[PDB]
Amino acid sequence: SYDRAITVFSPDGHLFQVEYAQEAVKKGSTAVGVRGRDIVVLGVEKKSVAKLQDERTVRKICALDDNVCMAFAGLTADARIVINRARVECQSHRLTVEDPVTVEYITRYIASLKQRYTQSNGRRPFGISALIVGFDFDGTPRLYQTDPSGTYHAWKANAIGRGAKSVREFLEKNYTDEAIETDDLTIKLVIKALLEVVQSGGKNIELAVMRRDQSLKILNPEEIEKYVAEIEKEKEENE
Amino acid sequence: TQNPMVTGTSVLGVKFEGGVVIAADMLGSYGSLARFRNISRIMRVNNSTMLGASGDYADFQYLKQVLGQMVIDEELLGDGHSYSPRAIHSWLTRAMYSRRSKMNPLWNTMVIGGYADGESFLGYVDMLGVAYEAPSLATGYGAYLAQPLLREVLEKQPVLSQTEARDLVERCMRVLYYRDARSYNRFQIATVTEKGVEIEGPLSTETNWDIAHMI
Amino acid sequence: TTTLAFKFRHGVIVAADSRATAGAYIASQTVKKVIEINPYLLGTMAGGAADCSFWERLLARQCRIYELRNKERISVAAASKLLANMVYQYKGMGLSMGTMICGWDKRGPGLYYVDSEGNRISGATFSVGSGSVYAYGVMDRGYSYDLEVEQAYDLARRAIYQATYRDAYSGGAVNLYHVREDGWIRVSSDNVADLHEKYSG
Amino acid sequence: YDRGVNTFSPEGRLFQVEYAIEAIKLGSTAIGIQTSEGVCLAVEKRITSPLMEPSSIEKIVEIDAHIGCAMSGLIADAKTLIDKARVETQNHWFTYNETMTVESVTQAVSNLALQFGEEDSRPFGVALLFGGVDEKGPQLFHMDPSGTFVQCDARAIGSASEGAQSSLQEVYHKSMTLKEAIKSSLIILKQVMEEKLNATNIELATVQPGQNFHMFTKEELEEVIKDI
Amino acid sequence: RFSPYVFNGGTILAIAGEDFAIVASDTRLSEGFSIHTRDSPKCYKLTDKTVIGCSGFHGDCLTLTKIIEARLKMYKHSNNKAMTTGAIAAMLSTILYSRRFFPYYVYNIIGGLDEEGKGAVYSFDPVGSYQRDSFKAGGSASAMLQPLLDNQVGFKNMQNVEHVPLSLDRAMRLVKDVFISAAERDVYTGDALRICIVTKEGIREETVSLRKD
Amino acid sequence: TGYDLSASTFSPDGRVFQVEYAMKAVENSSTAIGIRCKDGVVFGVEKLVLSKLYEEGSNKRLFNVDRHVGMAVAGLLADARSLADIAREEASNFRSNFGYNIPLKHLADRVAMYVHAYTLYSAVRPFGCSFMLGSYSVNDGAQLYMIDPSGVSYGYWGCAIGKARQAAKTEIEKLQMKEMTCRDIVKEVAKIIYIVHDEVKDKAFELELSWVGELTNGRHEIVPKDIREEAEKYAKESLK
Amino acid sequence: SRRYDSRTTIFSPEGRLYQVEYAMEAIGHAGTCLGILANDGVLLAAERRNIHKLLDEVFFSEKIYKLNEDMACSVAGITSDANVLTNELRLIAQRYLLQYQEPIPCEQLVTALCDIKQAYTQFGGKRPFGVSLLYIGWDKHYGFQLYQSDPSGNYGGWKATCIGNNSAAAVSMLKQDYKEGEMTLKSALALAIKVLNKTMDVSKLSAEKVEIATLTRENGKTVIRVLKQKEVEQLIKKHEEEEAKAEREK
Amino acid sequence: NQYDNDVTVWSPQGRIHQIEYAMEAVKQGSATVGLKSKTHAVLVALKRAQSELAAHQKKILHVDNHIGISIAGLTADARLLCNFMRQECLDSRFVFDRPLPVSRLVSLIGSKTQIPTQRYGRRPYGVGLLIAGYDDMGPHIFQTCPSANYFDCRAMSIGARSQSARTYLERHMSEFMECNLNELVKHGLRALRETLPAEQDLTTKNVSIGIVGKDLEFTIYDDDDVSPFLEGLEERPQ
Amino acid sequence: SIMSYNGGAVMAMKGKNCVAIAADRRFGIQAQMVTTDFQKIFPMGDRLYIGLAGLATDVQTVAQRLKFRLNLYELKEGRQIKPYTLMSMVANLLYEKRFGPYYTEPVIAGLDPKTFKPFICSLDLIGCPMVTDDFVVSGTCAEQMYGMCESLWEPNMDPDHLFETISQAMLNAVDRDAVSGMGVIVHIIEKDKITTRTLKARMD
């Protein structure tokens, strides 16, 4: 190994590199996620396709189990390592314990790995922040987030990446319980949040949902077009 | 050691008033052939305690080496503190037990005799780690042959003199010369008091054979 | 040595004897064989005292760790799985262990059977020991699922009485534990001679 | 790099440990009070968003059936310490059929509060309050990053701990009762917090010798708050 | 070849009273068809309320006694208080299983007081189980002593015999009678008797001779 | 200034300044001399009481490594203790591997290699010790060696380690060293130690004298200096 | 001991990364490669570094490495630094084939090499593999494929790739001359001839300064065609006839 | 000042200043005093607290049946060397079945603390040991240092403002040798009441006393067998 | 024996300008057969085969390991492998398990990669090579195939008589054998082409 202190404290009581490795997350792509009562929804923005290539390998949303889903921001390689180890961990949990994997267990593993990885001798911290969405115990929807420190932190909706303060400001006018909680209206409202992004080109939107019993469904950018059209229709009804 | 090559034979030791006398013979038999008829089987440890052993002689050379180095180290500490004979007994018991726990036993049968601080000491260490104190010890076939003489006279007389102890040892070694096949008419007497440790020379026995003139 | 266990509509019955011999010589008459792992688990002693006692204590330690880490009580299958994985790592070195695991689950009743040979299996009735076959006979006479409570008490008590009556390596006090949804409850500790006077006629 | 992990001062102690004692200060506050009736304990969560679900943030964790806890500042290192401390107390139950008493718990923690080592890893940035009920009655225990473990009767940590310790020294004595100490703590809490006190800010953790189980108050805490 | 075990024999007794724990043992140490000594007490005084006896192979007895003493000092020097009786029993069970696959050839009996101040006898096996019983006889003369203790202590197999709590001097005459009667027929028993009594006021010892053969 | 930091680096003029700084560390230490006679080697260390806080018989720098070998260290005491432990270990290996007494040349060369191995790398510092080694043997005579902090180890008749390194050997070498038995050399070392620094900078000192040779029959021990009391009845005659 | 430590894996004082950006700027000054959009087959193009006349050219391959049977790879950057990577890549693919007796489906191969590179991005504190390199291949699950490794560990599955400062204008020509549907390999070869005609400073495109290798599916074989020089010569003559066709607008 | 950073670097004046910094870190501990009679050895330390409500940080801790140590400086190194001390005691108590002589134990402590004073990668141990024990030749009062140059005395005192204590030990070291336990202990606190400023007086809860005797086992005391020790005093000479 | 656990017989025969290798088809447990299509002659490059006989575990294991090392060699160097090189590789692979030995008797038969020169050799279960000029045999039955080939071999053989000779040898030596039977596969290779024929053997 390398016997040196990548972790040193500040003269005023900080960690120079963990809060600062959050900046690499802060300068990555945006991704949101909410829970409905029966259907959970998330998606990433900024596919940033050069219109003439493939994109099926750059997918930032994958799965570890048939119950749980991933998301991240920041740089993608640390996400790839964490996802590989997370697949291994969920399957090793399936080896002993015969349950479907609880979301809280795999988040504790990810956060525990992240903190004992940052603690050790000469290993660069993972500059990601994951979103771990699943519904296992009696179909109860849960979504947790991470941090480069390794703090799993359960929410009901979330916004990360570039300009997440703005996205959460849209989420402020979106924190009503009603908002009618339909599947199409909640998904399209998430779509409207991704529409409140810095560019909102209309074709770079990628969203995937899970209805707490099925598997992952990759959508088709015509249903989202009708979602955007009816969002524009409701915006016209405001006038 | 699984198979002892060159074995000794029985060792006798007994306390008396302010001292312990130990005598063992000087034979190095291999099988039945008395191959090494001039060897030393008693180590005179530094100034108080004193060692005599049985079984494989090479292992006794090894423990002589190790104990010599330890005694040299404490004497070079210069603190004025030495090993009590009971401490040596404890170390030797732990050494033999840790040998046999690893299934590599030291084939020996050891007797530790010492006189320190007014009190005599006579300790025993077996190969298997069985270790105890006794007013009179007898190893090998000595526990079968010269032990009841020791236990007879110590029951008959609880205290002793130095002369009575030495005479009784002389008689027991004569008897062991009479009917041990692994025995030899040459033995040395070693004695500790408060005056130091003394190794006597290669004494012998005076025998009788007047039963042979009968048919 | 003869233990049994069977689950039914109202939970799980566990009974055992209390004789533990040594070859042809009986050591004690009051060996509490059903090792109380938790307020919701009961382990037994089935072949060997030290192995069953030690490994069930280690399993109880592990279960308490699991509960204190997840704030949620362990299942039965998980405990049997952990026990089988811990026992499997000394296979062939001479461990004799045939214990049983009983408890209440999210699914409800749970009954598994873990050997030192590693035959972790589910089921509804089990019986371990030298005279286990006698218990199998009279139990599979009297077995149903829709039994009452005192009927099941009489079934287990009669079964252990017949087993200790025929086998030579079994005897002593008949313990009787009852696993419920909330927790297990000791019923009674009955001697053989009392059952002989009561059930001989 | 301006004197890293392995150097004293010209006048005093080590740099990094002093910087850890500085590092505690950014954490949220917590107050535990030893009382002969039992140990009580309280904390502030510092919730930012309404999305930030209140019952998921942990400050009081469950060490044993009669041992509580409180942490500071950094969360995950504290969770690691909690995990291994639980393992070692469970090891005590394994080899002793009994409860590792709270002083022996914190000695087992502070054997490696400072075992920080990168060669032959960093010191930890958390101050911990431990409460429990041993055979000598209740106990309240306070440790630090430096391992300087001491018994405290009613310790306050973290942010704004100066006025908390002062105004706690104003009201504390030896013959306190339970509920008086509970409300006397939460008065200090709503003097040191910044928001209005309601059901989701704070959480209580009380352990009694006869009520060893359930080191928590769940939404009777609302009734406790409305009594001021 | 070299065999790692040998049978040294011995007989250790324990009786759990209402507020006392009597542990007695002969001090004969033998091997095969010889006598090594007539003074080797199997009893050992650990604390003010704990006496352990160890029979069987003698070297393992010495090693186990010293390791238990070391761990007693470790608990005391770590946690400012002595161990209980059951903690020592649990620890000894962990030790006897910690050398499972190379066993001690040692019978073990721990007597002592609990935390309520009552008698408690914890038996053992060579491999590491234990249980809290009222009376045990360990070693070669176990079977010569267990049914008589079943007759007298347990009042078993009797009719119209009420249960009197076992007093002290009655237990003393019991111990003397059972060791004389067992020393008549055993070959591994005699030449002395070291009786240890644990009360709420300390440890007593007592030396009673026997027959000299 | 730039090159005296590490113990691995060389200088623009070609030497290691760490070794020099460790050599002049021993310059502030107590004065320790030694001299041999025709049947033995005598040591002597000018040892000082602090003010009034000592006990006259603690922490003696005259060690005793083997049955016939001891050290006469001066400098940092704990480093000398560790080095003495290494020397005891090396004499232990030789006695354990060959069954007889260690020759002093081989012992000194092994110790010099150990010191050199601590002078090479950058992880470790050079030693802050400089010590003496005496011996006697029936087939070899008296041997007196000398080890610097660098590791240069060769032999002397007499030496001195401390402040008055020159100022002792100014009048050490005018001793008729061959024709004297060591029983004269006892009061000779007494007068040499008593000459240097009676009262000028410090207040009081105290004498130790080590002693090996034929007169000890091959043993090494401190003299019974109180027996024959040879310093003071000659020290009071050495001031005039 | 602690004053000889470079940064190696430590973040910047402004929020960025050091060895990754400097590895990319080590990539940009190297040889230019590319592959094309072709369905029934896929190709590679490569530029000869060190075109001095006193070489041997007896290796048959300077940028291509025929790695398993149905996969090759181009490369750009430090050479033996990549040769170690080719050794490990082939060894990983061959132990995969050892494990299953079925050829490697090429994306877990790409993730294997990317995680090898990533392991020296986080810990180890060594010089990162400052080499980007291509991938061609075939499978049972997607057919013909193209992939692009990077020193960060990110890989994109491309259909028309990108190498450094000499090839940004090449990718601009790839987008302004995007093709889809025409899988005819000769059209793609004419396109690549056009791309390296603009981008390379080789005057009039000497064939000694270029290298082209293709990979077609033949009956059950998936042969890799490291083609010879004469067909390159007549391809260039075809392309310069197409330049005459381009100046038919005069 | 750029050579004064690490343990490996010798200074150009030869004084390794990391050792001096560890010494000054020892000088910022609590006051403690150790002294022996011909038959009894008594060491007395001083406790301090962070605030009024908290308990006092203890200094005198138990080691073995006849060995007890005082301490000043850091507490992590204190408990580290404590665990090593108990381990090395029970090792020889296991092997040789005897109590340890004190001199070889303190030599092993010095040989233990040598390694963190010579290689690169460990700090010198901030530690303030005052060791009392019983070999065959009576009580011993040893002290250590972070430079591992352990001393034997008849009466020492280390910690903050401990020099007036040393003056007291100078002017009563002749009187120390003859007396029994009681006036010896009150000489010890007639050093500790000068380790304090004069406008306050030594109370119960801040002082600790540990006696080991040639027939007496080592025992620590706190406030209750110290209320007998605190009476038998006069006021300071105001 | 352990060699007679699953049966097996491999014959290779060198002709004039070509080489012929043949083996049996039977797979089964000690007395119970299972299938008639078990492969024991493996292609290792062009115009060069290898045959494996003995325990089927070591047959498939050594075949996959050898294919592993063979492709690593043929990828580090673009040329194809000479047979002596393959022989030394098989010797090294078997000799790595000197004390953990495989139960196999590999037989290598191939042509020259530059010329049309044939090659035969055989090895033992520890890595003892043996090059000859006429024929090598392996498997359970030995003396049968030795008697047949020492009865039927001629030095200069057109491939047709080579085929008929190895055909008659395999048919008669298999029909005399008990545990190895149930069909014969024959590979007769040369510079121009590769022929694989299956014979109508007695299914008894």
Chain interruptions in chain C, by residue before each (C–N > 2.5 Å): none
Nearest chain I alpha carbon to G102: I64
Q: d(Cα G174, Cα G36) in Å, to the nearest integer?
A: 9
Closest CA–CA distance from residue G244 to any residue of chain I (Å) = 41
Find tokens 């080191």 and name the residue. D215
3+ Cβ–Cβ pairs closer than 8 Å linking B and I: no
Residue C64 contacts D where some CB pair is shorter than 8 Å: yes
Q: How close is the nearest chain F Cα to the Cα of H216, in Å?
A: 25
CATH number (domain holding residue F95)? 3.60.20.10
Task: Return the CA Rg of chain C.
Answer: 16
CA-to-CA distance for H124 and H17, rounded, in angstroms? Answer: 11
F95: tokens are 């006695």
Phi, psi torsion values for C59, nearest 5 degrees? -70, -35
Alpha carbon G11 to chain centroid distance?
30
Name residue D44's beta-bridge partners.
D202
Question: Range of A27's domain?
Answer: 1-239
CA I73 from chain centre, in angstroms, equals 22
How far apart are the two ends of chain C, measured CA to CA in Å? 26
CB A149 to CB D74 under 8 A? yes
Q: 10 Å Cβ neighbour count for C28?
A: 17
Structure determined by: cryo-EM
Between chain B and chain H, the number of residue pairs with CB atoms below 8 A apart is 23
Q: How far apart are CA H23 and CA H27, in angstroms?
A: 6
Distance from CA of E127 to the nearest CA of C (A): 6
Q: At what angle do helices G185-199 and G230-246 cross, to 10 degrees?
A: 70
Structure-token pair, residue F212: 């090996």
Q: Which residues of A71-88 are buried (b: 16+ CB within 10 A; e: fewer)?
A: bbbbbbbbbbbbbeebbe
Q: Which residues of F27-62 are buried (b: 16+ CB within 10 A; e: fewer)?
A: eebbbbbbbbbebbbbbbbbbeeeeebbeeeeeebb
Select from D84, D92, D94 the residue whose CB has the most chain C CBs within 10 Å, as the one to mutate to test that interface: D94
Nearest-10 crossing angle of helices A223-237, A183-195: 80
Distance CA E73, CA E82 (A): 9
Q: Minimal Cα–Cα distance from A125 to chain G, Å?
A: 7
Chain H positions touching F126 (Cβ under 8 A) are: 10
- Start-to-end C-alpha separation, chain G: 71
d(CA G173, CA G190): 13
Handedness of CA E36, E40, E42, E46 (dihedral sign): negative
Report CA-CA distances (Å) from C87 to A177, C93, C119, F199. 52, 11, 11, 80
E85 neighbors E47 (Cβ within 8 angstroms): no
The string of DSSP letters for H33-100 reads EEEE-SSEEEEEEE-B-SSSSS-PBP--EE-SSS-EEE--S-SHHHHHHHHHHHHHHHHHHHHT-SPP
Cα–Cα dist H124/D7, whole Å: 9
Domain B1-215 in CATH 3.20.20.120? no
Q: What is the residue extent of each domain of chain B? A: 1-215
* CB of C46 closer than 8 Å to CB of C3: yes
The DSSP code for B187 is E
Q: Structure resolution in Å?
A: 4.9
Residues of G with Cβ-Cβ distance to I77 under 8 angstroms? none
Q: How far is D171 from chain A (nearest CA, A)?
A: 32
Asked whether the CA dihedral A126, A128, A129, A135 is positive or negative, the reply is negative
Chain A residues whose CB is inside 8 A of the C75 CB are 99
Say if the Cβ atoms of G101 and I71 lie within 8 Å: no
Q: Which two tokens stand for residue D175?
A: 């013959």
Alpha-carbon distances, residue D187 vs D31, D161, D218, H201 (angstroms): 11, 14, 19, 36
Q: How far apart are CA D96 and CA D60, in angstroms?
A: 26
Closest-CA distance of chain A to residue D187, Å: 29
A138 touches chain C (CB under 8 A): no
Q: Are D42 and D30 in contact (CB under 8 A)?
A: yes
Q: What is the CATH number of domain C1-201?
A: 3.60.20.10
How far does I60 lie from chain G, in Å, by closest CA? 11
Hey, what's the torsion of the CAs at F148, F153, F155, F158, to 10 degrees? Answer: 10
Phi-psi region of D202 (alpha: psi -120 to 50; beta: other; left: phi over 0): beta
Query: With contacts defined as CB-CB under 8 Å, which chain D residues touch C69?
Result: 83, 86
Grouping H, G, I as helix, E, B as strand and the rest as coil, residue H117 is helix
The alpha-carbon radius of gyration of chain B (Å, integer) is 17
Q: Is F113 helix (H, G, I), strand (E, B) or coil?
A: helix
Identify residues of G whose CB sits under 8 angstroms from chain I CBs: 60, 66-69, 90-91, 94-95, 97-98, 101
CA distance B10 to H42: 53
Which residue in the set C57, C58, C68 is minimally distant from D62, CB to CB?
Answer: C68
C163 is in an annotated binding site: no
Beta strands H138-143 and G210-215 are unpaired
Residue among B25, B20, B53, B26 at smallest CA distance from B198? B20
Residues of B in contact with H135 (CB under 8 A): 79, 81
What is the CB neighbour count within 10 angstroms for residue D38?
22
**Contact yes or no for G156 and A53 at CB 8 A:** yes
Rounded to 10°, the helix I143-152/I159-176 angle is 150
Residues facing residue I12 across a β-bridge: I21, I136
Beta-ladder partners of F211:
F42, F221
Cα–Cα distance measured from residue D128 to residue D130, given in angstroms and rounded to the nearest whole number: 6
**C-alpha D83 chain-centroid distance:** 15
Strand, coil or helix: C86 = helix
Q: Tell me which residue in F64, F65, F92 faces B69 most closely, judged by beta carbons.
A: F92
The neighbour count for residue E169, using CB atoms within 10 Å, is 7
Return d(Cα E9, Cα F153) in angstroms, integer. Answer: 63
Cα first-last separation, chain B: 46
Going by C-alpha positions, the residue among D201, D174, D156 that lies closest to residue D48 is D201
Report d(CA A185, CA A231) in Å as an integer.
9
Contacts of E1 in chain B (CB under 8 A): 2-3
Say how far apart CA I159 and CA B22 lie, in whole Å.
Answer: 96
Option in E94, E101, E129 nearest C49 (CB): E129
CB contacts < 8 A, A to C, total 13
Separation between Cα atoms, residue E184 and residue A5, nearest integer Å = 75
Instruction: Please say whether the beta carbons of A68 and A132 come within 8 A.
Output: yes
- The CB density around residue C12, as the number of other CB atoms within 10 Å, is 22
Q: Which residues of C touch E (CB under 8 A)?
A: 25, 27-28, 30-32, 48-51, 53-54, 93-94
Decide if B160 contacts B20 (C-beta within 8 A). no
**Could you tell me the strand order of the sheet in which H40-46 lies?**
H155-158, H32-36, H40-46, H207-213, H219-221
Chain centroid offset of residue I72 CA: 23
DSSP string, G27-91: HSSS--EEE---SS-EEEEEE-S---TT----SS-SS-EE-SSS-EE-EES-HHHHHHHHHHHHH
Q: What does the DSSP 8-state code read for residue B44?
A: -
Across the interface, of H95, H104, H135, the residue whose CB is closest to B91 is H95
Nearest alpha-carbon partner for D139 in D154, D128, D124, D126: D154
- Report the distance separating Cα D207 and Cα D64, nearest Å: 11
The token duo for G136 is: 């061609």
- Of B1, B49, B163, B207, the active-site residue reads B1
B81–H contact, CB cutoff 8 A: yes
Residue in E with minimal Cα distance to H61: E77
Q: Are I145 and I171 in contact (CB under 8 A)?
A: no
Please state, as a whole number, how many other Cβ atoms lie within 10 Å of the Cβ of residue I131: 13
Domains of chain D: 1-228 (3.60.20.10)
Which chains border H (3 or more CB–CB pairs < 8 Å)? B, D, E, F
Q: Alpha-carbon Rg of chain H, whole angstroms? A: 18
C-alpha–C-alpha distance, residues A168 and H81, integer Å: 54
Please give the domain boundaries of chain G with CATH numbers for all domains: 1-250 (3.60.20.10)
B84·H98 Cβ contact <8 A: yes
What DSSP state is assigned to residue F72? Answer: B
Q: Are B122 and B112 in contact (CB under 8 A)?
A: yes
Instruction: Please tell me if residue I64 touches chain G, with a CB cutoff of 8 Å.
Output: yes
Give the CA distances from residue E41 to residues E7, E190, E196, in Å, rounded to whole numbers and listed in that order.
Answer: 17, 12, 11
DSSP for chain D, written as a single string: --S-TT---SSSS-HHHHHHHHHGGGSPPEEEE--TT-BEEEEE-----SSS-GGGS-SS---SSSEEEE--S-SHHHHHHHHHHHHHHHHHHHHHSSPPPHHHHHHHHHTSTT---S---PPP----EEEEEETTEEEEEE--TT---EE-SEEE-STTHHHHHHHHHHH--TT--HHHHHHHHHHHHHHH-SSPP-TTTEEE--B-STT-S-----SSHHHHHTT-
CB A218 within 8 A of CB A208: yes
Residues of chain D in Cβ contact (below 8 Å) with chain E: 94-98, 101, 103-104, 107
Report the SS3 class of residue F58. Answer: coil
What subunits touch chain I, counting only 3 or more CB pairs under 8 A?
G
Write out the two tokens for F125. 């510092």
Cβ–Cβ < 8 Å for G94, G68 = yes
Residue A139 DSSP class = G
Could you give the CA distance from residue A40 to residue A157 in angstroms, rounded to a whole number? 10
Which residues partner with E53 through β-bridges?
E43, E109
Q: What residue has token string 């207040």?
A: F203
Q: Which residues of G touch I75 (CB under 8 A)?
A: 66-68, 90, 94
Give the torsion sign (CA, C132, C138, C144, C148).
negative
Distance CA B152, CA G219 (A): 106
H94/E77 CB distance under 8 A:
no
Domains plus CATH for chain H? 1-238 (3.60.20.10)
Region for D19 from its dihedrals, namely left if φ exceeds 0, alpha if ψ lies in -120 to 50, beta otherwise: alpha
Dist CA A87 CA F228 (whole Å): 87
Could you tell me where the DSSP H helices lie in chain I? 56-76, 83-95, 143-152, 159-176
Please answer yes or no on whether I68 and G91 come within 8 Å at the CB atom.
Answer: no
Secondary structure (DSSP) of H119-176: SSS-PPP----EEEEEETTEEEEEE--TT---EE-SEEEESTTTHHHHHHHHTTTTTG
Q: With CB atoms and an 8 Å threshold, state whether G123 touches A122.
A: yes
Q: At what angle do helices H163-170 and H181-192 cross, to 10 degrees?
A: 140
**CA–CA min distance G50, chain A (Å):** 32
Cβ–Cβ gap D148/H54 under 8 Å: no
Give H 45-64 residues with CB within 8 A of chain D: 50-55, 57
Told to judge if C21 belongs to the known catalytic residues of this protein, a careful annotator would answer no
Please give the residue of chain F at the shortest CA–CA distance from H157: F53
* Residue with tokens 């000859």, as numbered in its chain: I132
CB-nearest partner of A52 from G11, G122, G175: G175
Confirm if A71 and A159 have CB atoms less than 8 A apart: no
Task: In whole angstroms, give the CA distance from residue G97 to residue G91.
Answer: 10
- How many CB pairs lie under 8 A apart between chains D and E? 20
Crossing angle for the helix pair E85-98 and D76-96, to the nearest 10 degrees: 100
Q: Which residue has the tokens 């492709």?
A: I71
Whose CA is closest to H57, among H73, H35, H80? H73
Tokens of E207: 């030396």
Total count of domains within chain F: 1
I residues 76..95 contacting G (CB < 8 A): 78
Domains along chain E?
Answer: 1-213 (3.60.20.10)
Strand partners, F222: F210
Among candidates G9, G147, G160 on the partner chain, residue whose Cβ is nearest the Cβ of A124: G9
| Number of residues assigned to chain I | 204
- Taking the alpha carbons at both ends of chain H, their separation in whole angstroms is 46
Element (H, E) at A155: strand A153-155
Question: What does the alpha-carbon distance between residue A113 and residue E140 come to, in Å, rounded to a whole number?
Answer: 57
What is the DSSP track for E148-208? HHHHHTS-TT-SS---PPP-HHHHHHHHHHHHHHHHHH-SS--S--EEEEEETTEEEEEE-
Instruction: Determine the structural domain holding residue I151 and report its residue range.
Output: 1-204
Amino acid at F185: I
Which H/E stretch holds residue B41? none
Task: Name subunits touching E (3+ CB pairs < 8 A).
Answer: B, C, D, H
C-alpha neighbours within 13 Å on the C-beta side of residue C94: 5
